[PDB]
Amino acid sequence: RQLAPLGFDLMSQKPKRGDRSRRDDDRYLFLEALISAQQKLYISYIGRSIQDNSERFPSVLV
Amino acid sequence: FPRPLTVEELLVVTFTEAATAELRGRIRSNIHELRIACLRETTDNPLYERLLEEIDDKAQAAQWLLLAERQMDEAAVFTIHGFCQRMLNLNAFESGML
Amino acid sequence: QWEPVLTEWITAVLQAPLNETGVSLSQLSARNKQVEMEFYLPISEPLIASQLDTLIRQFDPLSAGCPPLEFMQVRGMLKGFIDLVFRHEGRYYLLDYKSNWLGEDSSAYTQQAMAAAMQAHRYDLQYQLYTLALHRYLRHRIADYDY
Amino acid sequence: LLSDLESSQELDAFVDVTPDNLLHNIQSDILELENRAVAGVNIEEFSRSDNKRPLDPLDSSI
Amino acid sequence: MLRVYHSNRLDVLEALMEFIVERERLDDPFEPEMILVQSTGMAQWLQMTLSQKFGIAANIDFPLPASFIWDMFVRVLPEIPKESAFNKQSMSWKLMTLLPQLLEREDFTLLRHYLTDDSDKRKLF
Secondary structure, three states, rough: EEEEEEOOOOOOOOOOOOOOHHHHHHHHHHHHHHHHHHOOOOOOOOOOOOOOOOOOOOOOOO | OOOOOHHOOEEEEEEOOOHHHHHHHHHHHHHHHHHHHHHHHHOHHHHHHHHHHOOOOOHHHHHHHHHHOOOOOOOOEEEEHHHHHHOOOOHHHHHHHO | OOHHHHHHHHHHEEEEEOOOOOOOHHOHHHHHHEEEEEEEEEEEEEEHHHHHHHHHHHHHHHHOOOOOOOOEEEEEEEEEEEEEEEEOOEEEEEEEEEEOOOOOOOOOHHHHHHHHHHHHHHHHHHHHHHHHHHHHHHHOOOOOOOO | OOOOOOOOEEEOOOOOOOOOOOHHHHHHHHHHHHOOOOOOOOHHHOOOOOOOOOOOOOOOOO | OOOEEEEHHHHHHHHHHHHHHHHOOOOOOOOEEEEOOOHHHHHHHHHHHHHHHHHEEEEEOOHHHHHHHHHHHHOOOOOOOOOOOOOOOHHHHHHHHHHHOOOOOOHHHHHHHHHHOOOOOOOOO
8 A cells, every 4th residue: 555755754764763654564464464374375366457358467565 | 877776766657557557567577587587697588688798797786676676566657647646745835735 | 501410410429328338439449440341251152042041040030020031042252341340348349330211210210110120121131241251350360269 | 673672581482384285385484584486596406396395286275 | 571572473472471461460450451452453352362261351451552651651750641732633733823923934935835825724734
């Protein structure tokens, strides 16, 4: 989920250790979901759009 | 170019949204193929072969493509209407917009 | 329009003695106060209505009135909200708040009438499940606990 | 930041995941911190594919 | 002493938390058990797992790390208000006041071009 900084925020200019960004939160969530599954893992995405029958792509994490 | 750049610093503008998602995956696949070609030092394709000939240090270049591969999620490929929306919301005060 | 009629009635509630010991609500220190306890009581085997009310009606005189409780077989965690829990003289108590009663003011709240509404709204099982909760919590938290 | 604490006493309990299914294979590699991907650095490694981990066709895990 | 528990899965840490409460029981019965959780679902899973073993789960506070530490401030240091004077809410109305006053300060002049164009006060909010 893409949440852009306000653009005048000073924290995004000089990042530090404990800085939290929504991009790194969802990227680490995909790792939490990978280790959490003890038996089966289900990952589904739309490869082809049903409307115009074009090509789509999965997330870079997948 | 005078200096190497980061994926997030490269701006690509394509008027169709469907072409921006295809070009994003097309670049994502070409960064992955060139990265493997840098580690293998050999490739079966003419374009990637001429690229490996110009590459000085293949080890550092493979690390740059790896960092370029992980950032392809925030890689910027936008339409004209999708650009201004992100740009005017970046700096609000110069544009004078909510 | 309310506040003049409220601040008085509130003082009458806090100063009212309770049970035999005559405990007043104002005598409780904040150390002994626990407000809005949320407990999770697991039920292991499926709970059957008829298999329950028979035990209820056995030892409980209040379960004689009204038909047996009707609920589908349920297995899982039980939830509930305890209004107030406090200890006095080394003895814990259980408190709950009910208002309702749109039409009644005078003595129509009495020992027979209050218990008559307890059987009407099925508050019997409610405090019986609240006690089983509190009994398990006091058994778990207090070392060498006796009911 | 956790390892930076001076007075903290750290102790670990880790349950080893015995790799069987494709899911337990990945959780292993992430736990033991090893790279199981074959890059094919040399043509001798690029040819034989048996050095990878065998995958059962009946695995529904991932 | 601050102790850090490392584990591969959460079920081991939850079982270790069950052992810590089991080996030592709190003197005062009404003292709640402080457990820090960042969401509601994480706290609601701990309640069902703790109640599944001990037999019940009651009097467990689940605040946020920001509310917890702030609650720790009032206990340790006197004179602190229970809730602060600076919040995501109140600071918005306080700035809605100062900002019309701080215009043309020779610094904010970059911000002045955003407001003084025109507004219904929506831009100020």
